[PDB]
Paper text:
Beyond its canonical trimeric spike-forming region containing gp27- and gp5-like domains, [name] harbors a C-terminal extension, rendering it an evolved VgrG protein. The C-terminal portion of the [name] spike protein is predicted to function as a metallopeptidase because of the presence of a signature zinc-binding HEXXH motif. In this work, we find that the [name] C-terminal domain (VgrG2bC-ter) elicits toxicity in the bacterial periplasm, counteracted by a cognate immunity protein.
We solved the structure of VgrG2bC-ter, encompassing residues 833–1,019, using crystals of both the native and the selenomethionine-substituted forms with resolutions of 3.2 and 3.0 Å, respectively. The VgrG2bC-ter protomer possesses a single domain composed of six α helices and three β strands, forming a shallow bowl with multiple small loops. A PDB search using the DALI server identified several thermolysin-like metallopeptidases as structural homologs of the VgrG2bC-ter effector domain. Although metallopeptidases target diverse substrates, the overall core fold of three α helices (α2, α3, and α5) and two β strands (β2 and β3) is highly conserved and bears the classical HEXXH catalytic motif typical of these zinc-dependent enzymes, where X is any amino acid. Indeed, the conformations of the HEXXH residues in our structure are suggestive of metal ion coordination, and the geometry suggests that the electron density in the putative metal-binding site corresponds to a divalent cation such as zinc. The assigned zinc ion is coordinated by the two histidine residues of the catalytic triad and has a third glutamate ligand (E983) at the top of helix α5.
Numbering used by the authors:
A (entry chain A): 833 to 1013
B (entry chain B): 835 to 1013
Write the structure that this text describes.
């Protein structure tokens, strides 16, 4: 069983390097670019920290093993699954659907700030599965965003956006002020 | 620590390439020539369907070498330095031996072997665990008791012995390993 852990994690990173090297870098001209409302939505969270020009919404899977009800953001482009296709404007969808979009955008923000969301992601996803680590983040004093895994990083940012839209900036900034910089 | 990691990462990358570009385009590449079918028939006979077999003068993966050849799916992928060969049967005996070696994997694939996974595992295990790549014939050891790669070398070296020293000298040395 501890033999399965090292093996499983390495095999998952190996598969990530393979996909990375194989279909290396996305076609800037392919997909669809962010809408006026979508740029506004993300600007309210990320501001001018990300170049929204780069960001592309592709209604196609990144890999054949990607789920029907799943979304990937490895290269700074967002790949929508079979059940999440046909959305022209994410800013004109439900608050929970908008939250999903802010989540994927955090991976796009990570990528734009020098993070290998493909490798780092594959490693952390496999490590939390086999090493049984808790899926849900737990806020701690002295812990910044960067001390969490790339998926929790997203969950945090999304949950902040949802708190700020549902309970106002007052309630949101009190809880998330520590973790964000 | 590096061994378990390295081997698993190598098999993981193989499953990824396998799942990703799964199965080759039967109509793509180039099919075996009359001479090439004859060449292989003398070794493999009617054990393989030569119709399936396709010679593609393109890399299987970007990390494949200039002086390297891959045969993972029952199609042969030629590297940068091995391109432009219209007929392998009209090339040097050593160049024909290479072709028989690649054909052994094509024969393994056609007989139920996952050349991609089994290969990636064995190649990585032989590198990190520093195990002897070069086969050494042993009594009681059948071809199936050797690496998918050794299996390729054994069959090729047999073909070369049979062409250079005749079937007499070749069949005396290789009769044991082959069935
Ligand atoms: Zn995600
Ligand atoms: Zn080979």
């Amino acid at each position: 069983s501890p033999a399965s852990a090292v093996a499983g994690i390495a095999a998952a990173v190996g598969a990530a390097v393979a996909v990375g090297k194989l279909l290396g870098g996305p076609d800037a001209e392919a997909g669809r670019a962010l809408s006026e409302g979508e740029i506004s939505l993300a600007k309210g969270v990320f501001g001018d920290s990300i170049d929204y020009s780069t960001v592309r919404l592709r209604d196609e899977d990144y890999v054949p093993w990607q789920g029907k009800d799943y979304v990937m953001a490895p290269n700074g482009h967002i790949y929508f699954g079979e059940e999440l296709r046909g959305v022209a404007d994410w800013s004109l969808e439900s608050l929970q659907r908008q939250g999903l979009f802010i989540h994927e955008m955090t991976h796009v923000w990570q990528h734009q700030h020098g993070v290998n969301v493909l490798l780092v992601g594959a490693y952390q996803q496999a490590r939390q599965f086999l090493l049984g680590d808790q899926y849900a983040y737990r806020l701690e004093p002295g812990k910044t965003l960067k001390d969490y895994n790339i998926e929790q990083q997203g969950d945090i940012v999304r949950d902040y956006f949802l708190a700020a839209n549902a309970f106002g900036e007052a309630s949101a900034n009190s809880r998330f002020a520590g973790v964000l910089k």
